[PDB]
RNA sequence: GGAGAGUUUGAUCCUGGCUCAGGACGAACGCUGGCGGCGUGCCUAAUACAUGCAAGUCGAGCGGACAGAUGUUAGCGGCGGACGGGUGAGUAACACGUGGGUAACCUGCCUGUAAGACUGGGAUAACUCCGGGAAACCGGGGCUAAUACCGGAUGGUUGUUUGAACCGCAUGGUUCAAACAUAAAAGGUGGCUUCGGCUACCACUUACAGAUGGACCCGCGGCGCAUUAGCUAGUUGGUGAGGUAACGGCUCACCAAGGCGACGAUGCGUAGCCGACCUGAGAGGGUGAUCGGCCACACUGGGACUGAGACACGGCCCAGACUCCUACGGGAGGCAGCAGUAGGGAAUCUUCCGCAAUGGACGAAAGUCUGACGGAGCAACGCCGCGUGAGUGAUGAAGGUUUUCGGAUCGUAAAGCUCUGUUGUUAGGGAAGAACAAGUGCCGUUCGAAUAGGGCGGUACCUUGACGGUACCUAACCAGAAAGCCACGGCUAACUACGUGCCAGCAGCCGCGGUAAUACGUAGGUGGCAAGCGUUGUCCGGAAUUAUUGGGCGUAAAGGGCUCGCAGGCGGUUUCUUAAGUCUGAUGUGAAAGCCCCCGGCUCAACCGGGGAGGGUCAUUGGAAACUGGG
């Protein structure tokens, strides 16, 4: 069916886009984790302002759920305040 | 189907006049063919069925429907059977026999509250006015051709089912208990 | 039994096995197994056709066939009516019905269905013998 | 969305409808939330009977009447009652 | 309006061997369908007890909760009668 | 509201089993066959599938094309394709039913209430060119728009932190306040313009409601097998972390040794479950076709993507088997959608018409799509209705059959005479099912700065039927075209003759058949039904025949060889008390359809519709307290 074929093309192309966003959010999250492991606040606290960006970015584009973010934020922010 | 066969041998087998006159039983009041509890029950069912001229399947269901009413099952079963339009036509005297009354109805000569009913087995209700249609007002068989539950007017050729019979009006040859027995098997 | 004894070990209804158990299988070629499907007739191939002696005190030559059904069961059937056209390799239709006096015969061949011909010059009970109404 | 629509009952050449509140994805003659009334277009004139208290309950929840239902509501004066309630 | 209520069950403890976890039993009389005699039925329940208050024998109250593990859907409320 | 009968004997009573009369079918088979209305129609191979069709739409998001103002649509984008439709394989499971819970949840579209919609950027299909494929296609270069995508602006979101200020079922919940960090969005069409813009509508963003749908957990209920007794090691719990929309061995590490089971675990076998349906006096048994709910599944096994929702019937990816293509290199496909085919089978339909109606998708709408659905076709497959004649008519004709040849019967049956036209044939006439939507006006109201022109509600006008010239109706003509099937010893309604002579045959049972056969075959008649009637299969009844209602155990089958006993079952008397049983009230719920009841519509009925009733080992919350159970 025509409309299936178009959906398949798009589904592949929305996917690759989506991995860009996931990856860039996994970057921001892991940076905070290594920053809090180093026990450096300034790095960690700035990385959490970025992680929040990349996390809520995904929540804008449906790729993360309100709830799945609010977890990730809390988890990370607890480490930054654990400094 | 309907039975179109000889009317007399039925009377003769049952040992009652089904016409009500006596004439089937004038010359030979004995069973057809060269030999002239279940039996008696069956005899009585076949009595009442053959009289009014309905086929068993419709008769067994007219009995099931009468059971639902309040009173004696046999009594109420005779009452509906009497309400049938072919019978009411025959009782009002618009026809000489029930088989004529059927054909009157079936071919659409009859009216019930002014409107054509071409169904013998129509179950006529109190208040309803049986009449002849205007095309058939001068039928020979009607001109040629009454109980208290009915009322007729031979000028206008239109009757009325004023009340339900009550059982003393209906055929006293019939032991309806036997038929209620017949079906309880 | 006491109520408590019934609570513990209840009443057990009997088993009521089929009068016609070759009608009550099927056969799945692909799975190579018996189905459990009741049928009102079956088809089968006559592997032998002959006559049997009834059990005493009856005496005649009773016309039978030895049929292998579609479900792969092999059953003796009775051949009713006067005179028949069944040879080996006839395709027949069997119904239910034991013949009382023939030990082994739990099925009747249907007359007038498949290769089994109707009974000739029958005029009463024709339908039971697979015979068309003579005049017109 | 929740709709108000006609469910086909009756028999082959004699349709009769019940006005049911139903989610859109439900099958026509299947699952429904509430019956609101009955439309018999075959009789002359078409016999319509509607239980306002529900009809309005469901208009104000934002169930949308199908085109015919809309017009059935109009003729009983529901659509007026609905419009006047949003103002007053 | 007020909250809706969880199920409450008064039962007897039949294990304390698990950490923070009692196995309560509730014994009720289910009619037999056919006969009409009432029969003793036992239903075990795992419940969560944080301070290990309840011990084997005790008549405890429990209340239903969200799942607290694979099997625990109850918390210990009270210990109505202690063991002997 | 409940019917019996036959059969162990020389005869008998009892015990006991068997057999039959009834009712049902998604039935089949045989014989027969007119019509109409309303239903039903692969139960087997969840076998394999030819061909066509079943999911698209939007140009009022967007460039580019191609036609000639305007129309058309490869492509991008939005939404739909997770519905509707099919099947019942798997599943003995919180799958399902019923009742609860979530303070452990998610929810596009719709409705309402508010706030908003600021300012930038770089791309990329289409196109055009080029390279490699046999094809499927695919790989390069350069262009281009978006209501596509990505930056910042501002937000009442969410984090985290600090307050207060109440409350619950532990975990906690709600409402407010502050700080800090993170978070949005879009235009398109018409009008009016002062040309800047402004306005309506549709769209867009966020929050909170509402509705709707979904998720999870729990009580309780509905199979067989002990010739299945042990089963488990992420198993059971804990502690953390991870993960999920969400709780949770869900996952992992570590620690502990747990967990389940004779109330039947575990295994094996069988099964989708339910409303219902069939049978029955009921209790109960059986079924789970059609219709409605829920679940599961989509060649088979496995995984994920996109999305509000899928681990996706007509989507991806992997693996396998199979079929098709082929330039052998690789490609393509999955009727358990509607038709249809082959195969299997006793056996089950047209490769139909229309979107007019009712739904659904998309659209501002016109529309477009719709094998949903509405209709039509085929089949006596079922249910209901009407026919195939009616009145009169001895002469009791002929003919047939029987015959103590007198007569009897077929038989008022026939003819004759008089009628009718249901139907049939033919010719006229001819519906309802239709509401609309849209467009047009007019009125009210609402937005608006613009009496512009939109929204919303009134009112008018207008115009669309597949069925279908079909139903129905009127007129004319003709008893003309329209009765079979089974049985007839008893059970069981209805009997004689001839032929046959333990043979041919019949049969459910008792049995029948070797010269008087009411039982075989035929004929006449009779009987029971009737467009059907028989036969077979299957289920329930008859079967107080697994017995709770409702049976028994001296001798008919049936008292453990006997103890001691664990569990279990059962428990003297009085009084107090509780109230788990028990009785009773109220509330909530037990969908619709069905069944039953009362009405109403089809000429009647079947069927259809409206109102009601019923139905729980039900939840919740009050009463009573004798009895049973606590104390």
Author numbering:
A (entry chain S): 4 to 86
B (entry chain F): 2 to 37, 46 to 154, 161 to 200
C (entry chain L): 2 to 137
D (entry chain P): 2 to 89
E (entry chain Q): 2 to 85
Which sentences from the paper describe this structure?
Like other family members, Bacillus subtilis RNase R has a central RNB catalytic domain, flanked by two cold-shock domains (CSD1 and CSD2) at the N terminus, and an S1 domain with a lysine and arginine-rich tail (hereafter, K/R-rich tail) at the C terminus. In addition, RNase R contains a unique helix-turn-helix (HTH) domain proximal to CSD1, which is absent in other family members, such as RNase II. Collectively, our results provide a mechanistic basis for the degradation of 30S mediated by RNase R, and reveal that RNase R targets orphaned 30S subunits using a dynamic mechanism involving an anchored switching of binding sites.
The best resolved RNase R–30S complex, which we refer to as state I, had the highest particle number (28,143; 2%) and an average resolution of 3.1 Å. In state I, RNase R is bound between the head and the body of the 30S subunit, adjacent to the exit site of the mRNA channel. Specifically, the CSD1 and CSD2 domains of RNase R contact the 30S head, forming interactions with ribosomal protein uS7 and 16S rRNA helix 40 (h40), respectively. The latter interaction is well-resolved, such that the side chain of Arg148 in CSD2 is observed to come within hydrogen-bonding distance of the backbone of G1184 in h40. The N-terminal HTH domain and the tri-helix region (residues 477–534) in the RNB domain of RNase R contact the platform region of the 30S body. The binding site of RNase R overlaps with that of ribosomal protein bS21, which is completely absent in state I, suggesting either that RNase R displaces bS21 from the ribosome upon binding, or that dissociation of bS21 is a prerequisite for RNase R binding. Instead, we observed additional density for the missing 3′ nucleotides that passes behind the single-stranded region of h28 and extends towards the lumen of RNase R. In addition, this state appears to represent a roadblock, because to continue degradation of the 16S rRNA, the enzyme would have to thread the remaining 16S rRNA around neck nucleotides 931–945.
